[PDB]
Design a protein around this ligand. Sequence first.
Ligand SMILES: C[N+](C)(C)[C@@H](Cc1cnc[nH]1)C(=O)O
Ligand SMILES: [Mg+2]
Length: 322
Amino acid sequence: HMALSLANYLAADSAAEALRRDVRAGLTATQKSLPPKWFYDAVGSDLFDQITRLPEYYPTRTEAQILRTRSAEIISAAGADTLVELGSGTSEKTRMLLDAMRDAELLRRFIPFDVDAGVLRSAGAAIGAEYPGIEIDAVCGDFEEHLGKIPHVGRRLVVFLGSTIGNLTPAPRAEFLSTLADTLQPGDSLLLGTDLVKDTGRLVRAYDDAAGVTAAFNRNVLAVVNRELSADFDLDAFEHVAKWNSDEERIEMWLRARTAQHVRVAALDLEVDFAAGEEMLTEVSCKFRPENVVAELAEAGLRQTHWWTDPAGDFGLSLAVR
Ligand SMILES: C[N+](C)(C)[C@@H](Cc1cnc[nH]1)C(=O)O
Ligand SMILES: [Mg+2]
């Protein structure tokens, strides 16, 4: 099944330059950091897939169970014939929504939007084979820059699942939602997944699993830098640390140097020192309160028409309209 349309707004040389800029800025900052987008090379994407099946990492299965039991209601409320996914279309959650759109005799079109064109091609072929006659228009782009490149055809249900929105701190998060709302037409809908404030032990353990998989995922960002920028990070020298930040109500992932480290990043003509015990921030994952989700949507210009949550209150899905 080779039927496909694909627009690609991302260039290899542009991505390499973004990594250079990000690593230089993050490793020379007074408090070191690295952006989590760089976790998702081939290795890191596979580790994240594994994370979604860990006993401690409740978000994926919780969101999936909400969609499993409520997809027909979501689809009926949206009335859309086109599913736009800020994501690659590889998950069972995608099929739950497409199945419900098919069951309702609404489904015409799938628009996956993500950063890896090869994965979009694979997902497109799989979706095409499962939903014969569906139009697939894939977009390779950055969801903080190319949202205007998503086609406007049809009545669109735009979905952003998994609480990936929690990787944006409040100012960029507000800008993202405001921009997204300005690409929607009357009649379009946003389905947004948000992980919720809950027991703090359960939160920390979800990012510090017993098997060490999250720790490997986190340290792999050092392997990305090592490979792409000719650096010599010693991954064994960095401890994985997950923290609950109660002031910002967010999970944080950090890497902590066990002993002083001297790291050359040869491609940047840069050497960088870590003191013993020095920590570097690699990810934030903001957790939400239901009343604040409504307010953030409203501030972006969207009205929350529906809210779904599991019986434990662990996770929330919002449907919002212009
Ligand atoms: C895919 N998101 C960004 C939603 C995940 C990434 C992640 C999982 N374990 C550590 N980081 C999340 O924040 O829970
Ligand atoms: Mg040099």
